[PDB]
Subunit: 147 residues, 3 copies
């Protein structure tokens, strides 16, 4: 019969996919915060980042009870450390820009934020590829439990 | 056994938290609409506000069947009045800006929009603190129904 | 008793409503991408469009198993063709702008993107009105199955 056993792996995959995409948009938003001469837009984009941080934290709290295998748990903990580095460097370019220190805002973006964002993205990509391998294994043997 | 009785209070809390955050980002978006010299961006941010209004209205229609106690119902009705004032003042700065009346757009933002947004935010904060007190009371006696 | 038979038509309606709204905001975002002199903002808005494309594709994959009647299925297939035209013209103004060809970015916006977006919006409106007629018919005879 219709096997809805495939909804934890599907949900994990879809969450992680969205997470990867959102981080990529954040890279461009943080760049705009650092580089833009339009102050009202910079404030709006910083406020937006403050909201998306909570959105991400809550997706974290959703997904982490589902991540139970050793390799994915290891990747997840790594992501959780690089995320601290990332949030700190992003909030530093934001705080610098908001205080009229644009040159430092860009020096922090290039020298600290982008490397952290790249590590974050590498780890997210790894987790997603891992999760697709897991989702296919789990679907194959749900089909062999239905066979 | 696992007591999923804790999902109406949790859902109410998470919705209201998100609502509070979104209003804070709206304050910054409306400010950009009023102050920015970049017309295409102003149009994009006004279109965005028109979408988030529907998103909020539909969250309202989600949450209001769950709000049943007298103090929270009172707060909710207050919010529903201040929201009319808020939407009207926000749409007025938008309409003024779209018609080339920037000076009035900013005078309306400062003299009418920001006060309304502050009242809205005060009421949302109250509702969230109320809902956290309710969520803890309800979890404590779900644990005493499991004891 | 409480008849939750009304949740497929309600869900379809709410998804399609949101889809219509999001396309309207995309029209304004693509216009900003084409017209704005602020390069960092243009990059951020293009990255955002790349994320919302996946969001829409996944809403498509959600809704299409629910669309089973001939008139709505016909509208849906039409939308799926106009969406290819739309994504191509939007990505062309984006790619042109990112490469320093602003004049062509605006000529493509006006001569190719806006017409496609208008067709897309016409079809989405049709689908939503269709879905409201279907939702009312289905609710009326769920009430006559409860009568």
């Amino acid at each position: 019969a219709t096997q809805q056993m495939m909804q934890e792996p599907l949900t994990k995959e879809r969450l992680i996919s969205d997470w990867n995409s959102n981080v990529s948009v954040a890279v461009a938003r943080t760049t705009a915060i650092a580089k833009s001469s339009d102050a009202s837009l910079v404030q709006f984009l910083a406020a937006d980042a403050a909201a998306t941080t909570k959105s991400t934290a809550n997706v974290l709290k959703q997904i982490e009870p589902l991540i139970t295998q050793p390799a994915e748990r290891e990747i997840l903990d790594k992501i959780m450390q690089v995320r601290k580095t990332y949030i700190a460097s992003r909030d530093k370019v934001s705080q610098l820009k908001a205080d009229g220190m644009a040159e430092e805002a860009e020096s922090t973006l290039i020298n600290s934020y982008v490397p952290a964002a790249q590590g974050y993205l590498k780890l997210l990509g790894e987790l997603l590829n891992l999760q697709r391998a897991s989702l296919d294994a789990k679907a194959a043997e749900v089909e062999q439990i239905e066979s």
